[PDB]
Amino acid sequence: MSEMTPREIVSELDKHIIGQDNAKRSVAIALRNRWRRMQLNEELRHEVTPKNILMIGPTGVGKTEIARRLAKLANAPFIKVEATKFTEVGYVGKEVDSIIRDLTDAAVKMVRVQAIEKNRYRAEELAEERILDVLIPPAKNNWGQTEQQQEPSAARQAFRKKLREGQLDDKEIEKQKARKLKIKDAMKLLIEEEAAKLVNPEELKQDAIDAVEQHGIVFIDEIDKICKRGESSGPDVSREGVQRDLLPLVEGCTVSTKHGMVKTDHILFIASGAFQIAKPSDLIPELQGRLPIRVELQALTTSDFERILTEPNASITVQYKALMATEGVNIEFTDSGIKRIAEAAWQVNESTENIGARRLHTVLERLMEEISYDASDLSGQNITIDADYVSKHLDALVADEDLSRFIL
Amino acid sequence: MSEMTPREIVSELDKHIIGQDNAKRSVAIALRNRWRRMQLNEELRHEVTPKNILMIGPTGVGKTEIARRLAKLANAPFIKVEATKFTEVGYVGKEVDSIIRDLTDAAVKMVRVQAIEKNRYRAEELAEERILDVLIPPAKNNWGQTEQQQEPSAARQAFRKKLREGQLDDKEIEKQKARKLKIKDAMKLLIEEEAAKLVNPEELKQDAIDAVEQHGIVFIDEIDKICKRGESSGPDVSREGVQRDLLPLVEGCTVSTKHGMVKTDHILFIASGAFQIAKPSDLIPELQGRLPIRVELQALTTSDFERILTEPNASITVQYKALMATEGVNIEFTDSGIKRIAEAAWQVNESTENIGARRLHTVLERLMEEISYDASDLSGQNITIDADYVSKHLDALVADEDLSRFIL
Amino acid sequence: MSEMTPREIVSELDKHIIGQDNAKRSVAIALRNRWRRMQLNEELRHEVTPKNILMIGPTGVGKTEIARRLAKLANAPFIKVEATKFTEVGYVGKEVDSIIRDLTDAAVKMVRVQAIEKNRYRAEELAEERILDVLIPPAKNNWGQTEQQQEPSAARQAFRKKLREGQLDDKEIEKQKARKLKIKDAMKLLIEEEAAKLVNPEELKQDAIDAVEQHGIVFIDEIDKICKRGESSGPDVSREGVQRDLLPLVEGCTVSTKHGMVKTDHILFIASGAFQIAKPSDLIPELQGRLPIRVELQALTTSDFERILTEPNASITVQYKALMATEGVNIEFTDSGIKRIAEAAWQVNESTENIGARRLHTVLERLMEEISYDASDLSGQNITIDADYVSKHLDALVADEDLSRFIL
Amino acid sequence: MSEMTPREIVSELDKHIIGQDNAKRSVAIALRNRWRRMQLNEELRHEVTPKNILMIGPTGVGKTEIARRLAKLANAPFIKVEATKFTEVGYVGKEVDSIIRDLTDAAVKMVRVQAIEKNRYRAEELAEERILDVLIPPAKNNWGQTEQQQEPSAARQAFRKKLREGQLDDKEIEKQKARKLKIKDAMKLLIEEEAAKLVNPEELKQDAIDAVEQHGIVFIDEIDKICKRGESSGPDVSREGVQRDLLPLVEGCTVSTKHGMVKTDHILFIASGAFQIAKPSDLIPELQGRLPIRVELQALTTSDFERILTEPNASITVQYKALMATEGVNIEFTDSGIKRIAEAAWQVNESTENIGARRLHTVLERLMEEISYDASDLSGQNITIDADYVSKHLDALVADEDLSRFIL
């Protein structure tokens, strides 16, 4: 099982989300206040109430990714539903118990794929027993010693080591089979047709169910755009409603679905958004109060950037190096470009409109349009990417405001 | 069977709902005016009419939880439907006899789980007879005495006491089975595949039907916002209708459904909401008359809070201690912080807007942000949470109006 | 079969609907004009046309209950559809052939339950044959005399009389069974599992069908709010439409449904409502003319009340006595309170708004809030409820207008 | 497997999309920034993010066809969804994860047909073994040599060469068969009933899944008309939402589907449209940031046309020749008509409104009305289509503005 202490939770955070400590902090305080529970009895296993979180602040500084990530290391199943959607001011038809239904549909194509390296390496030593079986059969009547089985190997395990270097031969092996095929096929087959025997009844469900149930985490994005305070950001309280609908979810219900009936009850909720338009004080009271833990995030810096450009472990930048290396190019970003790199983000974000950390992403892939293209030429060649570089393909762009409008 | 006297019903209320005596009172007066019925004949079993309840008052002072709980000890099935919902001013598609429909779908995953420690302990002694049977068979032809049965036990009840300390052996027992498995599995199985023989035909229905039918209790929240008198709380009498739709439910009909045909006729209804917009006199007559018993509730006090902070048996505050302890921290709340604890909620509720008892929930989880976080360090350490404490992390917050607007 | 002469029909009416004679009158004249038909041939069995009724008048004086009841003694299946509904000015989706579909869904959970005391007392003498069968078996090879069967009873019918006073023993009796249970269970079982053998193929349908088909009665409430005459009570003739849709029903069609295809044709219709807004002259002509029989009702009196308070056979008042007795309380209403009781209704209904007979209901349950609560104390005690009583808990209430607004 | 280098990707473009080099370029830069990924590990296989593309420019100059084709040689599965669609301002019901859903439903009737000349020529040699088997059976007990198998052929491979010139005989061969048919049938059958044994379990899915997944490419057409800045191209931010909905798709989710559960995460997206109404800077941030790579296209020239008229490998013009030949007409276009051919499109596009390259298509099929009709007469006759020609059937048309409005 998972847990992690408060700080532990944080620290893996600072691994991919620069700054906003306060932020992290809370979310972890929610995720232990979580664990804690379990460890009680039955009374209070069921009278204490997922400490759901309200995420006030500007855009692109990481409310989402703070959640997204928290959850990945919780190893919780997770989904982010935009608040908008349930509005349909195009007037369609939106039901909110859907949300829970998709927090299962990952809670699966999550259980699945998170079962093919736990039970994959367990059955490449079971797809071999099925070819060292057709090239040379362990002659009828095994005289039980389990050590006269590694004794077929007296040539059998000479073919076992010869499966990795010489294949493409015509063979046929044992709703079963009885089929005559070929070996590089078949090798790619059995595998598949073997994960099946790696039992998938009321296990990939029931426990996938447990998934959601135990908990993930839903991040209800934008909540603020669904509540009133008049003028420009009120049509009707034909939005107020979606706060209502919502309630139950957060406030605790069962729900109908596909793989099994699910209990929202204990699910964790993380409600986002910026409120230049209203004020959290402005939710329906009901909601207001299921959002116990409130926290601010604040806009990142120039530095903050620079640092997001490199101190993220998946770093953007690196994404480059490696990507870029693949064509035979070392690439290497100075202190002093990683400086302008940011520097631009910030200047651009300040003239057009500011989209968050977001800009770096675009500013970059643009830096490289040159390199990133010609790359397969540079076969070995290496390049120095630095201020003086940067500014040559940037400055006038960033310069041209109205271009940036289009193309950054 | 249940009943309880008027006062009995009450006194279990005051167990988790401070004050509002008048409230309780009524509700209980409904819940016997209920029983009484039964005890009559056939004439008046079917000519007297569940004494439905109109819950006029402010928000977060207990209308819901008064119902909610009433029902829990009625051991009735219960659902709270928000009135809004049937409106869809986004225009979707709402049918209202849905309401009754879900009052059944808990009337079940309520009959269910409330049938697995009644009939659970009855068949842990029936899943053993199914293993003390495969380890050592009571040899062919039992010479009837029922006392040469505890006489297989001359070694059989030596394996019965040895089922609690040594398992994981490879065994196979008797749309039946004929299946070769193992014993920590199989133990977790049989149980399940045994609650089946614990007959679940026209019983887990029929009587679940009675449930609803005999009753639970539907709490139609907000009734007030579905009724007209003009200006800012009338769009059209395109809400009028919801009252209309509803009608029947309360006014007495059959409804179509999944596990069986239900009759709404005698279910109990408790219709909530505040009416600063209209006035109960403003329901359609038909309804109006179906909300016979009328009651007011009154906004809780500073004291009332203080008392909610502690005199609730699930106490908030306690939730802490015990939640908090789990990290190795005794926590203790003075009289005199529970004082400011309240003191605050009240002062905040009076400056932004007042959400009810609701605020404590929020004000608190905020007190603790410190404690609740650092907690895993305080391994043993104990803390004294008291006025002087409170005010250090509160006073300026509460101070800062416009913050509180966000973060309480 | 049913019929009843005109007056007969009336008289059972005056049993629970004080006054409005004219009203009754008609409805019965419809219900014989009904019978009459059948008694003709084939020509005129199918050229004469259910004499459907238009029920003009104020609210709460009994259009509905005049119908509701008429039908119960017709023993017709019956439903009251609000006219509103099909409007959806929230814009959903309403189809009108639904109506007929629910006039079947009772025409069932009516046929059903009206078959378990016709065939219940027929099979408690068939669930015994199944226990006096397991406690002492009628030894192999019955030597046919039918009078050596009451001759097992030479001890068998000593256990038959002993089934009513000594049970809870462990027995097992004969998609059948083969099951080992216990006797207070099983007794509650067999019954159920025996109504099944009380044949339920193409009988509980086909004749339930006959139900509707033969006839009940639909009371289309409010019809007037679905027709035009401009100003405050016309949006569009986007309501006119529902008169249209409707037509066929009343005017004669088949309809698709669940248990069987149904023919509206001969169904009886009773169309309600008050027309302060328009005038019956104001229906679509088509409708106008399927509402042959027109009748007024007029608002009830003070007396009328008083009399509804006692001369109804299910009397309200009595509802009290008996309900109230159950806790050990005789209760007894004077001439002279039953006077004020009413007196209030009337005064209240005249200040706030007047809801019909409806008020009594509420005025009362309020009278008793005192008694109705403390009742379980009065264990024997008896009380005199009379003017001087009444006015002590009423007068100021009725006084306070604006309270009454809420709580009467 | 595919890849191709940046330039390689390009050069096959310039094969059917004259000019717009910059365009191509990018797109290719995406389609390697794609490959590269794969070649990394697991960390960065799943932390780098398909480099999605924003296609700013005028209409009919190639955005679509640049994508369309890109994908064809990527041999990716592809779909272009119009942004409009999800709007329904007629108000229907649009879900957007539909988009992904259809990117699968070609990802298939693409895997399918692209599996019947790979495995088609593999089993025309397997449907013969099934007739050289009924005409002359390889007599019981094959004495294993695999060279006394081509030795049935001592008359058997005399019937194998005689299957191409003499058929229609009455034969019967081996949920199998046992059926008595005939041989030109049966030949057209077996084939089919043989692509089945060419295994189609969790292969025609799973890998079709990969398709989408590894990728095709969705081209979200017109993105611009789903975003706000006011006046004539904003109704509400009841379009805003479409951007919202979309999000996830591009921003990374699982989607439910027919042949299997798909992950959108890594698919490639290329979002089109012109922005004379807004400005790419005007997308919701979230999106904005997911359109990393930005590119412009520029309206083609007279020349560019001329060159589209011919330098396309499928050439329009050629379409003619060959289409036209089929009637017995060589046709030949001078340099100097292909000149006016273009010359015209350009002059028309500048007077009515300019639809892009689009016009040639129309201008042409009009040139020909004459030829294209009379063609079946010109049996041999050959024609010289050239300026002086062109202008005889064009000049006054192009002349007549308001005609062209109708008829080009």
Ligand SMILES: Nc1ncnc2c1ncn2[C@@H]1O[C@H](COP(=O)(O)OP(=O)(O)O)[C@@H](O)[C@H]1O
């Ligand atoms: N504080 C930050 N530290 C690291 N990365 C960040 C930070 N803020 C934003 N980002 C990155 O830039 C984009 C913004 O993140 P996201 O969480 O979706 O923004 P927001 O929640 O603020 O709307 C993502 O690519 C995100 O991973």
Ligand SMILES: Nc1ncnc2c1ncn2[C@@H]1O[C@H](COP(=O)(O)OP(=O)(O)O)[C@@H](O)[C@H]1O
């Ligand atoms: N007066 C009450 N007595 C005890 N707790 C209350 C009371 N009113 C509100 N609460 C608390 O705050 C929450 C609000 O109760 P609720 O019944 O949902 O309020 P309301 O009906 O007024 O909307 C509950 O969880 C409960 O603990």
Ligand SMILES: Nc1ncnc2c1ncn2[C@@H]1O[C@H](COP(=O)(O)OP(=O)(O)O)[C@@H](O)[C@H]1O
């Ligand atoms: N004339 C009357 N005689 C007896 N009871 C009446 C009378 N009028 C109304 N009631 C009773 O008071 C309420 C009004 O009846 P209902 O038929 O639904 O009113 P309406 O049809 O006039 O809208 C019901 O409880 C009804 O049974």
Ligand SMILES: Nc1ncnc2c1ncn2[C@@H]1O[C@H](COP(=O)(O)OP(=O)(O)O)[C@@H](O)[C@H]1O
């Ligand atoms: N610049 C281009 N190069 C070659 N053909 C083009 C070009 N632009 C448009 N066309 C032709 O006219 C049609 C329009 O191409 P399309 O990609 O659909 O234009 P757009 O994206 O600008 O809407 C295509 O069938 C193609 O033959």
